[model samples]
Target: DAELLVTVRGGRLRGIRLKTPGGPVSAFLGIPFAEPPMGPRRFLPPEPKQPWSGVVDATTFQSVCYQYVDTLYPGFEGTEMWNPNRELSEDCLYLNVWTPYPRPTSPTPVLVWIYGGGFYSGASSLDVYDGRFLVQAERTVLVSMNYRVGAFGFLALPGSREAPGNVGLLDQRLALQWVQENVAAFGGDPTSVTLFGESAGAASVGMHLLSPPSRGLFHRAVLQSGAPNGPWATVGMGEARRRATQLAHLVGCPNDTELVACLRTRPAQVLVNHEWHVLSVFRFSFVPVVDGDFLSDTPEALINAGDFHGLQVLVGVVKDEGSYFLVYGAPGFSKDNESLISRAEFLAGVRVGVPQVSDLAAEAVVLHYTDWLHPEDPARLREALSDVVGDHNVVCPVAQLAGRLAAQGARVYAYVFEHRASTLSWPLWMGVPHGYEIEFIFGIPLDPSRNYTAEEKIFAQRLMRYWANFARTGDPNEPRDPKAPQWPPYTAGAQQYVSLDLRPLEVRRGLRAQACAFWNRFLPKLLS
Candidate 1:
């Protein structure tokens, strides 16, 4: 019957087995890691899921966490790609798993995914995030969990213990703990667990790496395109408290039903829908913040000074990580359905993008991107504006985090994805938009059901090998996938990384060295 069963968190579970071109995978979906965060539990860190009676059905996927699912920018196809593809519910604290057929606890390696969606939205059930093919392609156990997002996930009430901020991160940590406790039953080696994520997912992984309590929960990490030091990753406690109160005022929470209880009792949909008013250009109102309990300092400050288990890393970014925002979201930077990133527009975008950026530093950034080396024509301006966006939001933070991790005595392997698939919803002007690498990484092209070209299929398998290889042995170059090209480790001085491209998959040096200098070494001084 191809039916599978496993025993773990809740009770006896029944999963399904599916045959693929690569191999067979046993998938257990909607396994609860925590009780539903509804009613009294809302806005608080997750509570452990209670045991269920009888054989629980772990077949169909569960509802995604409560979040505002609409795109901020109308007709922006890029944002649409990541929208929750499932029913939304406040009772959504579930995780899914895919293990090799027959369930290889051969001390088999585990790859646990943390989704991004800027920490406000993302589900473990997205098509691009499915781990069936990757687990089959590489024979590793994969687990993806759904965590709360937006106001529900991260609303800090200044001095309120009832509503400390960063419940989203706490949710992630609880899931990690879940993984540690029970991954073995599903063939995942708890000790060999590798945490990986893209975009805000990457920042979640970074938080686990930087957070004090995540020690030994994971062995290795992959920061796909975001980091703790990213401009919008985490906010200060004061700002977090202010945003919560502002949200309360906007929602008309009276003195009796104040911030915490009003929010706890507020209908989930109304709460998330109201978040639109608080969202800015690239910033979300309710995001991970410096909650005094879980986190005493910002992720950047903690990573630079404190210590955690950051020993091995597979850190990288996409080629045109910023083009998506500039083309679709950045205000005053684009014209009617066309590009117009003129000098003044670029300068204004920078100031808005990096809040409190010093006046002189703004001039430096605007000049650096729009200097004599590049033209101010429409397409060139698109390039310049996206260059600024990528550097400030994605690239420099990623580079600096790798450097800081390396300085922390970690052996870091860096790479960049340079391929732009036909499947992406990005405009033609944008190059390899953010998260475009996901298709290949998850072996989408390798799936026989899809119409991917033969070359695309081969490339997808190779990408899986790189990730699967890294999952097994922290060094992605190890376990000898001898035929493919070798990816070198990144040194703080050498600054080497490989390009994950089909045609020119070669190692490169120093990702935007001059620009990175301004953001990492130069900008910090002026940001004060």
Candidate 2:
């Protein structure tokens, strides 16, 4: 009998209680933070949900926002088993809470999670995202909220009220506001909140760092494997408007003035079906755009202009972030076997990744990454390709952002996650690809069919401790445990970053220094 109750702004609600090593933890699932974005409200910013009169059962998860069927990575078919099979709807704007102290005399720190699915798919109810473990270990309040994704969340069109893009980001902002106003009711300290996420979610956290409306919403941020400066993070307004119009035409509502009304009447599945028709060269069609209000300029420009709220930050990337994107079944690289890439294939990939690079720059990139010793070895060629793509897409950009922030007098902690789980079936040389660090950070239990070594388990514990300590205090080193090595803040001159690995957890300086130098210093000059 795990029964608990609490009162919030909306109404009185009930939650479930679970016994943990530390003590009992209370969990409230599927509390509506915003009104359903349905009917007349479709595509507009989210509004606060109306209060209920009596006690409501919040033990079950609400329906997730409408999205195309997610199958994990592109080629990993039938991976939906990894996610929760919840009902889907347009009215899926709910949040969940886990608190160790249900009625605290003193407020506890809060960590709000934003899930990542490339801005197209993901829900807070996913099994891997369960917050009980982290909340129990850290004795802090944990929150995860559902935001609009896909065309329903980001479709910008000219002269249409429903076409102002970034409703998804707006939904996240509203949830943070709800936390500030109501988290104390659940024993959370509104003044001490940390926003954290991976991939698109991490990018969203970075965007909030720059957005004026999101100032004072969070005191700290943890960005994993994503940043605002990444090549694919934001879309230009012209491209965004064109995609919005294309979606309208695809769904049979081409007129700009009547687009909102036409989309409102269409079924949710119809819009989802036509989502890919508007994809640009980058493959992501619906993403955040430089709207005059929500976003005044590009993220790079804003950061360079000092147009952002300053706060303590933790940023990092996986050792081989692009390996997952190059896997067989991935978009644009669908080869299932390890076949040696031809010179033409390699140049084509470079063109696809950075379309503006001239032929001379493309050849230079090829020269820099080519492995002449084993030109015919498919495995070696693939490894070289992964290195190039990873540096260009994730590693280099993140390094630059951290360096810039550090130079501007921000307390910045950088890391490189290099642990490869025993459960993964990918090639050993792929080396801890993108999104692999999440399972460890969240302290998710391994499956019965899969086994984890003792070393891996210990590393997971240390990571959770580090993350929780950061949330409690802006400095991750506070209340530090001796099991993990001391992490130092990044400095522009030193360029030091912590390398997270099972053996010899050391502070390595100048990660990918040569590759990053080329991308940050040389490549830009060539393109310009």
Compared with the true structure, all predictions reach lDDT values of 0.80, 0.80
Q: Which candidate is the best by TM-score?
A: 1
Residues 1-528 of candidate 1: C-alpha lDDT, one tens digit per residue: 344877886688888886678678899998888988887878778888899888878888999888877656677656766887888898888889899886674779999999988878899998888888898878999999998888888887755767877888888888999999888888779989999999899988988877769865888899998998887888877788778887787878754236577766677777887787764255777888876667667777788895534478899999888876763456654423566556666667676665575688778777777758665575676687778888888999999888877877888999888877866665667778888888888888877777788888888888888888888888877485656567778888889999887774687899888889988877768766
Error of 1 at 285 (Å): 1.1
Candidate 2 residue spans exceeding 4 A from truth: 1-3, 19-23, 71-78, 81-84, 101-103, 158-160, 280-282, 307-310, 328-336, 372-376, 427-429, 446-450, 478-484
Return the lDDT, model 1, position 306. 58
Q: For model 1, how big is the CA root-mean-square deviation? A: 2.3
Which ten residues in a row are the worst by lDDT in model 1? 327-336
Q: Cα RMSD (Å) per model?
A: 2.3, 2.8
Q: Cα miss at 482, model 1 (Å)?
A: 5.3
TM-score of 1: 0.94
lDDT for 5 in candidate 1 is: 75
